[PDB]
Symmetry: none
Subunit: 150 residues, 2 copies
């Protein structure tokens, strides 16, 4: 059940949500999920994050998607402060190997990077959603499959 | 000849096969052709490809079918190293327009996506080959018709 999404998380069954660390993956059924590779020490992330946050507040519910922070922060403390500023989900910091698995899996060489996947099938939509969040703020072409074509 | 399948390729007369690049569509006559939408940046593809490779090498001749890579790679260099590892066919990377035509035609919204079509009628025979390759490694119910 939800084996597609589970393939992205060999070492975690639950992800964080602000206060609680109790949201279970299967609760994302039917949604488009975006992995956001980001960190507090990254200048472009600091500039992109507020943009992603506006996009999230505008379309999350309507377009039925979720966002999950996958942190490249180097300390549990930095992670905690940085993630406090976001409204979406996060892969716990303690799951470093899970961060590494996702980072290598999608070939993420730099941040910020925003990867869109389908929860139900576990299929990938695009690794280049970061650009589209700003180019298509009204989400007319969401979730932007194969942006890589351009 | 091969009028129907030829319409799937409005911009390429020949397709790849290793280092080749001289494969003509007429060779695919009377066969089932699987359009495999994939890219190096895709984890589920990376896990399915070796399964499809085993399946190809074990049934391509008997059940007589072919596989063609339709690449969502972001660059010619990525395509090159990614395709180098596959044994089947590929739509030339440079034909981005072609890849987009086929993407729109099969309505591919994410990858991996594997679609089987009857080369002769250009009809889609099956849309569940991705699942069934895994559930039916032996190729008992191939080609799992569902359209």
């Amino acid at each position: 059940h939800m084996s597609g999404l589970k393939k992205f998380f060999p070492y975690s069954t639950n992800v964080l949500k602000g206060a609680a660390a109790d949201i279970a993956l299967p609760s994302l059924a039917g949604k488009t999920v975006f992995f956001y590779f980001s960190a507090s020490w990254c200048p472009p992330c600091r500039a992109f994050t507020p943009q992603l946050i506006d996009f999230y507040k505008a379309h999350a519910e309507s377009k039925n998607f979720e966002v999950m922070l996958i942190s490249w922060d180097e300390s549990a403390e930095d992670f905690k402060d940085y993630y406090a500023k976001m409204p979406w989900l996060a892969l716990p910091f303690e799951d470093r190997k899970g961060m590494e698995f996702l980072t290598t899996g999608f070939d993420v060489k730099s941040i910020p990077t925003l990867v869109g996947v389908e929860a139900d099938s576990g299929n990938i939509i695009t690794t280049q959603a970061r650009t589209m969040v700003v180019k298509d703020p009204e989400a007319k072409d969401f979730p932007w499959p194969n942006v890589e074509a351009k």
